Symmetry: C3
Subunit: 230 residues, 3 copies
């Protein structure tokens, strides 16, 4: 296709589809009701991302937004994907540590604010205001990272050791990979425009696959997704 970033869109589509199929086959026959929840959540994540990468590849998930005196290609389908997948990923972590309901709602709600204000910033036509929305979205992300570190890490250690070990790995993966997102947005085509769109698409593709399929490979091999039973 005529968009140089097409190659990373095609690769992302393929890797999300492959991950979906792997998790779907691996989940076959699992009967433990706890493991069933984790397989359900964790297979839905790359299946959603598959459909939204495909929409970017085929050009449906792309729009033009006028700012800085130019017509800037903005892939809006990223936010339609992240609105559903990022809370599912926090639900995997919260169910692992058996978080209380109030904390789960705070996490999902702040996550909604993070994605929603990112979309508004991506579509805003006054250049300087784009970064106002970026800051509010980044502040919601910091709230989430704080809860994951100074709320979840304390319940985990009071839990099954294999639960504590798998949570600490997935938490560390989550904090590292999620913190890169606001940086890429800020220096790429949605923000300051220093990194061109084709490289930004590569970077997001590496992050998206790692945070969904990589995350899922660590979780679904773990013993912590099963009840303790004889």
């Amino acid at each position: 296709t005529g968009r140089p970033e097409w190659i990373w869109l095609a690769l992302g589509t393929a890797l999300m589809g492959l991950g979906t199929l792997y998790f779907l086959v691996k989940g076959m026959g699992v009967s433990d009701p706890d493991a069933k929840k984790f397989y359900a959540i964790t297979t839905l994540v790359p299946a959603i991302a598959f459909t939204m990468y495909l929409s970017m590849l085929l050009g449906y998930g792309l729009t033009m937004v006028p700012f800085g005196g130019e017509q800037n290609p903005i892939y809006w389908a990223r936010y339609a994907d992240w609105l559903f997948t990022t809370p599912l990923l926090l639900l995997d972590l919260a169910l692992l540590v058996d978080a209380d309901q109030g904390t789960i709602l705070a996490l999902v709600g702040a996550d909604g604010i993070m994605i929603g204000t990112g979309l508004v910033g991506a579509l805003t036509k006054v250049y300087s205001y784009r970064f106002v929305w970026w800051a509010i979205s980044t502040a919601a992300m910091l709230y989430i990272l704080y809860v994951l570190f100074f709320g979840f890490t304390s319940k985990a250690e009071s839990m099954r050791p294999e639960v504590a070990s798998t949570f600490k790995v997935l938490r560390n993966v989550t904090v590292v990979l999620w913190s890169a997102y606001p940086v890429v947005w800020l220096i790429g085509s949605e923000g300051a425009g220093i990194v061109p769109l084709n490289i930004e698409t590569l970077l997001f593709m590496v992050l998206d696959v790692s945070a969904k399929v990589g995350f899922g490979l660590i979780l679904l091999r773990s013993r912590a997704i099963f009840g303790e039973a004889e």
Copy 2:
């Protein structure tokens, strides 16, 4: 009005409103907390559909999509309706058989993918890609039908006989009526264009009323929506 399909839009509006009012009156005074859930879910279904049929009748729920070198009328409000009503209908069936939480999330999530990719296909301006989205949506539907047949039918029979009997009827109604949807889309105005819009609207109106009000009449007369009590 000047659209020949208006007559089926008006009839669908009337029948969804009548069904809503019937279920609402029938549910009055019910105090069993289990029956309350089923009345809540099952009355909300035609009330949503009422509002979205009304929006198609009045022309709000209609847009023009250019493909095949023509401006094609696409009723987008069908997908805004189905996004909310189809998971509610699966929730009626899953609560009947007391499905586990993981399975419920898999069903609702695949249902979301089915409707979401149907909307993308309905709005896509490259003709051949419309059928790519149709295929992905149909594959999510098959996943749902498989779960309903080779997961739910096995828990039901281990349940109350009246639960097993009412589930098997509603399952059979669900599988038959839901399988017709991808066929109508494919041969009507969203797809190959063999059946004209006014007949497609009739067919959908027959399906929508049967799958919501007919489904609801069978369920809410049943004894399975009540706890077993003296």
Copy 3:
């Protein structure tokens, strides 16, 4: 800015942000899992409203709708806010009285219909049909007010006295403040156009702050959000 209503948008933004920060600090260290739910729900409400007032202030949340032969400024972001905040506020009340699940779903679903049909009415280009949607939305509101009065008031009194006392106050605040919304819409710029936009914005700002921050100040000072414990 050049819109005379800007001053009430700026004041609303400031008061929602201040309320969010107050509730967030006040909630720090709370460990009771019940109180955690109420703090979670009640802090998310003004945080959402903050982001949507900011979008109206900066002009993102505004669109032009042609009706009555004019281009009418319609702030659509009000409905994106209310779609999420109004069910959260009903969830605060329902958890207080420990409502059954069926009733909670009926409330949230009717609330969804109320906001959804209000948005359709706000965006409808045939003037007389705007009031059809207003009537359907008002009928869903009456259903909600009826449940709050002839379902919730009866469970409350069978509960902890401090639960019964705090619910009755918050119910009365809710019924009074929520009933004003359909009146303002009808006589302001979305409806008959008797009250100009800058005054309508003031009225909504007074209502929104009272129904969210005022509501939240009454609830989160109360003893009813905590479990009874020694």
